[PDB]
Amino acid sequence: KIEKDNAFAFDLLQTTRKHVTEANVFISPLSVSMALNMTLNGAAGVTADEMKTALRETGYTMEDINEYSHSLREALLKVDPSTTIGMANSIWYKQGELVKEPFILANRTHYDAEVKAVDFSSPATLPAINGWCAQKTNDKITKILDYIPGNAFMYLINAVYFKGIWVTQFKKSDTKRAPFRKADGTTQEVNMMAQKSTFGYTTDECCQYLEMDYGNKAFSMIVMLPNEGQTTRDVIEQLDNKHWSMIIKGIRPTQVSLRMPRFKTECKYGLEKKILPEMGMNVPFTETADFPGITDAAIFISRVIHKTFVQVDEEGTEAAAVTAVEMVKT
Amino acid sequence: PINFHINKPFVFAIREKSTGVILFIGEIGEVKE
Ligand SMILES: [Cl-]
Ligand SMILES: [K+]
C-alpha cells in the first residue's frame, strides 16, 4: 500500500501557472497522472526515472503505481452514486505494428484501457478518437486532436468526467447582476449567485477558505479567496501538501453569506513544451527515449495534450478533462 | 454570518474526501459564460 498525497497536483498547478499567461488556469492532475502512468509501463532506464520524478512517484514500483491507480479509480467511481463520475482510458495504435502483450495487459488490467489498432491515415480515425473523447465527457470535450502526424505510433488517452449537484443549491431567483474585479484590475459585470447556509470554513494569513459539498458529501469544492491586497499568484506559489492539510483540518461548519459567480472556463495545454520538462521529464520527449516495454521500434513522446472544461451554476458543477499522450516513431 | 464574497480572482479545487485526491484545480481571473 502506498500513501500518495497531492504533491503532483500542487507542483503541476504551480508549474502551469508559471508558464501560461491566460487569466484562468484549470487542470486535472488526476487525468494527467493516469495517462502518463499508462505510458510509464513501457518506459525503461532514465526515461522511466524522469517520468516517475515528474509524477512525484520516485521510489514507487510500477506494480505499486498500477495497483494504487486501479484502487483509486474504482473508489472514485463508487463512493457517491448521486454524483456522476466517469474515468475512461484508451490506447490507439498504428495498425500493423507489434505492441507487446505484457504492456497492453498491464493497461487492460489496472486502467481498464480500451485497446484499438487503427489506420492513422484514414479520414475516419480523427472522428473515431475525438468521438470517444466526446462520449466520455458528456460532449464537453469534443476534440483532443486537430491532426495526426505522419509518424504517429500510439495515443494513450484518459478522460475524467464529473457532474455534481450542490448539497445546498442556490436559488436562480437570488442570482443578481454584480461586479467582478478581474486579474488585470478592470471590472466586469457577472451573474452573482447568492445563498446563506452552513458551509465548511477556515482562514489563515492570506485567505478565507470555503468547502461546498456535492451529493452525499464524498466530493466537495474548496474555494480559496485571498484577502484584499493579496494575490492568487501568491496562494498558488505557497500551496503544497503541508498547507492543504492545514486548510482541510481547519475547516469548521459555519453560517456563511456566500456570493459566487456563475462561471465557465475551457483550457488547453501542451504540457511537453515547458511544464513537464521543468517537473523533471526531459528524455521521454526526445529521440533518446526508451520504451522497450511497448515495442522494439524507436518511439518517444511528441505531445502531452491536456484539455479541460468546467461550468459552475446554481445547481452544481460539471467538469471534464482529457489527456492524450502522443507517441511517434523516430 | 461570515461574508464569503467571490468578486475578485480565486483558486478552487474539486476533491474527494476518502481518498483525499484533487480531481481538478484551477484559478479564475476572468468570469466567462
Ligand atoms: Cl501550454
Ligand atoms: K507552456
What is the chain B residue with the closest CA to A259? Answer: B5
Please report, for residues A66, A159, A247, B25, the alpha-carbon distance to residue B15 in angstroms, rounded to integers and kept in the order given: 21, 17, 13, 9
Declared resolution, Å: 1.7
Within 8 A by CB and 6+ apart from A265, the residues are: A24, A26, A308, A309, A310, B26, B28, B32
Each domain of chain B, given as residue ranges in start order, spans: 1-33
- Comparing CB atoms, the residue among A180, A201, A255 nearest residue B7 is A180
The b-or-e profile of A225-242 (16+ CB within 10 A means b, else e) is bbeeeeebbebbeebebe
- HSE value, Cβ hemisphere, 13 Å, CA-based, for A44: 11
Q: Which residue from A202, A207, A214 is spatially nearest to A251, judged by alpha carbons? A: A202
Q: Report CB contact under 8 Å: A319, B14.
A: yes
Q: Confirm or reject contact between A236 and chain B (CB < 8 A).
A: yes
Element (H, E) at A240: none
Which candidate in B2, B3, B5, B11 is best for mutational testing of the A interface (most A CBs within 10 A)? B11
Shortest Cα distance, chain A CAs vs residue B20, angstroms:
8
| CA A64 to centroid of chain Cα atoms | 21
* End-to-end Cα spacing for chain B: 29
Binding site members of A for Zn(2+) = 70, 110
Look at the block and give the residue holding cell 524522469: A50
- Comparing CB atoms, the residue among B18, B25, B29 nearest residue A218 is B18
Which cell goes with A139?
A: 460532449
Q: Which residue from A153, A225, A29 is spatially nearest to B9, judged by alpha carbons? A: A225
C-alpha A148/C-alpha A38 separation (Å) is 20
Ligand 1 center to A86 CA (angstroms): 25
C-alpha A312/C-alpha A29 separation (Å) is 19
Method: X-ray
Ligand 2 center to A93 CA (angstroms): 27
User: How much is the CA Rg of chain B, to the nearest whole Å?
Assistant: 13
Torsion of CA A251, A253, A258, A263, to 10 degrees: 50
Within 8 A by CB and 6+ apart from A74, the residues are: none
Q: What are phi and psi of A24, to 5 degrees?
A: -110, 145
